[PDB]
């Protein structure tokens, strides 16, 4: 599924991400824009053989099981395929564990490089939330 901007903001609020760990909804929408372009089915292979999955590009090195990332963990206790669903529940639940892990949203390098410090409220501007 490819979300629209306000459609995703709404879905993220419905699943409890707005102001989770103090990160406003525009932070989460901005991270999703630059990680996946709002596409739930996005996959990207990393140099090290891990893969990033879904709207928030969650990495198989730590968070999900894809059966092909040697020496990796599955701390969200989910198959990485669950992170590709039209329903963002699995991605949100897992993202809550990642953002609680100690470095906040810096875990998302695209959020650090493209969203952190910017006017992230623009991402929810005009949305009926
Ligand atoms: Cl957009
Ligand atoms: Cl915001
Ligand atoms: Cl594996
Ligand atoms: Cl594990
Ligand atoms: Cl699995
Ligand atoms: Cl959803
Ligand atoms: Cl923080
Ligand atoms: Na893994």
């Amino acid at each position: 599924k490819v979300f629209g901007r306000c459609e995703l903001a709404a879905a993220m609020k419905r699943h409890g991400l707005d102001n989770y760990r103090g990160y406003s909804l525009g932070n989460w929408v901005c991270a999703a824009k630059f990680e996946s372009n709002f596409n739930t089915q996005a996959t990207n292979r990393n140099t090290d053989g891990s893969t990033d999955y879904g709207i928030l590009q969650i990495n198989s090195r730590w968070w999900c099981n894809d059966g092909r990332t040697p020496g990796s963990r599955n701390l969200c206790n989910i198959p990485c395929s669950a992170l590709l669903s039209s329903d963002i529940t699995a991605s949100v639940n897992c993202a809550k564990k990642i953002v609680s892990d100690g470095n906040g949203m810096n875990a998302w390098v695209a959020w650090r490089n493209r969203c952190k410090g910017t006017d992230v409220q623009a991402w929810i501007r005009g949305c009926r939330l």
Side-chain angles (χ1 to χ4, degrees), residues 62-63 72-77:
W62 287 108
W63 301 109
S72 77
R73 305 284 290 281
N74 182 10
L75 294 171
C76 291
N77 302 294

Side-chain angles (χ1 to χ4, degrees), residues 20-128:
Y20 190 93
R21 280 272 163 157
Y23 287 99
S24 69
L25 196 52
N27 279 285
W28 292 107
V29 174
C30 184
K33 174 70 178 177
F34 293 127
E35 289 294 355
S36 66
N37 205 14
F38 299 154
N39 182 353
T40 65
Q41 293 197 81
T43 62
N44 289 291
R45 192 82 181 255
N46 303 313
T47 52
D48 66 0
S50 66
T51 300
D52 292 348
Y53 294 90
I55 193 106
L56 286 168
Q57 290 290 283
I58 293 174
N59 194 164
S60 64
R61 171 64 187 83
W62 287 108
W63 301 109
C64 63
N65 176 240
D66 68 7
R68 61 167 203 196
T69 312
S72 77
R73 305 284 290 281
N74 182 10
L75 294 171
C76 291
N77 302 294
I78 50 169
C80 296
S81 69
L83 294 176
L84 300 188
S85 180
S86 50
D87 179 324
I88 69 171
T89 302
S91 283
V92 167
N93 290 348
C94 186
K96 288 180 177 176
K97 186 169 284 132
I98 297 171
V99 74
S100 304
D101 186 58
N103 297 304
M105 287 198 65
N106 295 288
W108 290 277
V109 167
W111 175 89
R112 185 166 54 72
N113 288 331
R114 305 180 71 175
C115 300
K116 190 182 185 174
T118 78
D119 178 18
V120 296
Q121 189 278 333
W123 291 100
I124 62 174
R125 191 152 304 146
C127 306
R128 186 183 196 81

